Amino acid sequence: MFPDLKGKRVLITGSTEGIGLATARLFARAGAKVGLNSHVDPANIDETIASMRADGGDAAFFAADLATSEACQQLVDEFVAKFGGIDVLINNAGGLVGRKPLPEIDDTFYDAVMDANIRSVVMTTKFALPHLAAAAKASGQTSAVISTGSIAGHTGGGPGAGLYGAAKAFLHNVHKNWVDFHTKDGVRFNIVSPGTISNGIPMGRFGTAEEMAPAFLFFASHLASGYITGQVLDINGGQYKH
Amino acid sequence: MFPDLKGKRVLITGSTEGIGLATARLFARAGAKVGLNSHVDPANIDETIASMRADGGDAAFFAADLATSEACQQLVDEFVAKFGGIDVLINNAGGLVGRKPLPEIDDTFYDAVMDANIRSVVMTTKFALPHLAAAAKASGQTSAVISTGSIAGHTGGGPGAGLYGAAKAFLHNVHKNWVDFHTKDGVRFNIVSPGTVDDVRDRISNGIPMGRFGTAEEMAPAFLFFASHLASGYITGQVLDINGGQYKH
Amino acid sequence: MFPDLKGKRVLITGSTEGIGLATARLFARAGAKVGLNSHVDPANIDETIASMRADGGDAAFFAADLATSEACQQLVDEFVAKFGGIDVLINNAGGLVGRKPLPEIDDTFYDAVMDANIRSVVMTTKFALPHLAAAAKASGQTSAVISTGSIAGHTGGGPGAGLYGAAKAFLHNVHKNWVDFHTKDGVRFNIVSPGTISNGIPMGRFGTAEEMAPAFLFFASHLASGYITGQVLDINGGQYKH
Amino acid sequence: MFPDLKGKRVLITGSTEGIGLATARLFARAGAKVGLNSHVDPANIDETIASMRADGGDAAFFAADLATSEACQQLVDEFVAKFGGIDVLINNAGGLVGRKPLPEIDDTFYDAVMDANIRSVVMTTKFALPHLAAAAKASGQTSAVISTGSIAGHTGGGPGAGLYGAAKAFLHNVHKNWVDFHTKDGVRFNIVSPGTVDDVRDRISNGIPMGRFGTAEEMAPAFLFFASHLASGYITGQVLDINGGQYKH
């Protein structure tokens, strides 16, 4: 959609499914070098790369479960290894990984949800940073970091989803620091916060995944979101006002 | 820059200099018909219109002060007369209108700051709504309203700027009420919220993580993004702060 | 409730009814010199003053409709005239003054709602300021300003109440300035924001007026809210999280 | 200071110095039984207990690190064993636990900051809940949980403090989930959020409208206020920032 996205190294966690996939398509279709990601190789990974390669862009697939740090380190290495550097990081990887009411919340479930949603976004962002900071000085422009938020990061988790809500709230926050201490390194930080009961949505609809994806492109584009950093954008249909 | 804005009819208030202008010129480059607006025309106007028609869209100036509901009405009637409808509304009109600390606020001041920033926005939107809605029925898509906010609408205004800050805060809130009862009517409401914009100038540029104010040019793309049903079709009720990290909503 | 409230000049707009009344009772009952207010003299004003005079405090009644500036100026003068100064201002005066959908919103209704809720809180606060600033230097402590907010100041007006919501949002904001530019004068600013559909309140109940009133006392007390200024406190039962 | 806190049973974590302490001592002066807590007891402890029993309430120390769910459990069992219930829970335990910029964060650090501030709060509340609820059935009133937040939970943390800021932000949010599904259980959840607390010390005191940090003593009354069903019975889900105007939530 945006011209300057042409020829850009874009790393996208959780891009094999849903929103992460939806965006990936748009990034290649703007002529960008996308990195796909998942816990395990999806059946038709190569036929997917064929679509994106044809759209004007280029792609690759690096499997990794980011709940662990070493995995975050390698995912970064292997993407760098193919395209040689990074301009955009899209921390889409995450999820409920279940529902549990408070009394049922134990160490096992807690850690499954915490590391899935937070440690992933942190450690990855850490390993991607000095590469992102490079891309920015190189171009004299600005690299970009985007993470996937939620309405729950404002209002709190749904039924049994307490940790998921607060984990996204954690991310909304931790970016504000990263803006304070790494704006000087030429890296922007921003969040797309998708909003999914139908009576409390003025629109009535739920949100699709191609309803979400453009915000990401907007937030990665220096031309478009040059002076915007440290913001959350809720694509929810009016379920929450932010 | 966005495709589906070709031939969309766009009214933009206070739109003949700074942000409002930079926004319009770019709205020209998408091929959209735009309503330029000011209290009074500048000499520039014909050039502006020209360059805007050169870039592949269309322009047309309408004079109006929005401190008075009647101007807010007739302004819509004129625009709509010319282009036979509205697809996007941009409430940019507003301003500090001086800087008085609390003690020094009189009624002519209070009215001036309020009428400039709130009354305008409110009434203009009111008159527009049934037209906006109209186009939205036609398209089967969505017309869009976009109001220019401010950082002060979150942090409170600067020296003698209290009423500006609060007036913007007002807009942030009232948009939410409008999201409730007029999403039905097919109109999306959103807010671009600029930070401070171009010894006192220096001291504040220090704190902003990007070590400066924004150029009018950096506030523009957001509006289009908000205008583009393609881009922002399922986004209404939001605020987008373009401030170099000055505040993080 | 708080010891230091004993012997304090407290001005309370809209104190003849509901919450403003509820609080007034508590202020006198802590030994304070309260100023009551209304648009027009209420029938049993003097029997009310009898209750408060008996509780350990003292009171008076100054009628005024604060939609106009000159009225705000006199209300301030006449209270000062009786007790000689001000330590606490409680901008409770306000209200919907109707419901109107957007298309029906005209100059007459607009101004009725705007001046009732904003100009009142502004001009009054203006005229009270230098007297409040005096009380603070005198005691070396801090005077206090409190205003009545709403859930609507966060979420937006109810049906036809667009302006009421945004007007309270206006107040939430304008205090943040007053904190910036008059903390030096020894004056604190804070807001009690009462929250009144029963399915979206976790508690189930609506709020009473003696459920609200203590927050005010807490916010006026230097002993209790010495270091707190520029905050909003929602007494809503969990309808909105702030 | 508040009446209806006479004989209420109150657990307070990290409550043997600074804010947590100043809070407890005042909780003594209301005539409430309090659970003092630390990793390890200081020598002070007996004096503290004494002065707290002198002031007309009661004390009792329990050692525990809350980085581990088991300690969070047994700590509740001990307290509840001694005083046969809970009426108020105060999750104060937490801290910076060092200051590392992003690159320098390792897992032993990340775990340390997370376990200290989030895991604790979560689990402790979990174990407490059924007891808190219990007392609430008895009273026909409300037990109360109160978690110590921070300014960084809104503004993001300071140098090397990113994880502290975010952990507090986590608490702000999770309390809302708990308000939904456990108001039923008669427990109110709220947050006192201190700003920074007592050349680097100087430079930040500049911006705070009250030209300083808060004393532990100024953060204390809020907690009681939140504890007192009398005072705060219809308040749950809120945050109270005691920061001299540093941030205005």
Structural notes for this entry:
The structure is a homotetramer. The first copy, chain A, is of the alpha/beta class. Helices cover 42% and strands 16% of the residues of chain A. Chain A has helices spanning 18-28, 45-54, 69-83, 107-139, 152-155, 162-182, 213-220; strands at residues 9-12, 33-38, 58-63, 88-91, 143-148, 187-194, 231-235. The first copy, chain A, has a 7-stranded parallel sheet, with helices on both faces. Chain A is globular, with a radius of gyration of 17 Å. The first copy, chain A, starts with 8 loop residues before the first strand and ends in a 7-residue tail after the last strand. The B-C interface holds B 69, 101-103, 105, 107, 110, 114, 118-119, 122-123, 125-126, 129-130, 152-153, 155-157, 159, 161-163, 165-182 and C 69, 101-103, 105-107, 110, 114, 118-119, 122-123, 125-126, 129-130, 152-157, 159, 161-163, 165-182. Chains A, C: Belongs to the short-chain dehydrogenases/reductases (SDR) family. Chains A, C: Keywords: NADP, Nucleotide-binding, Oxidoreductase.
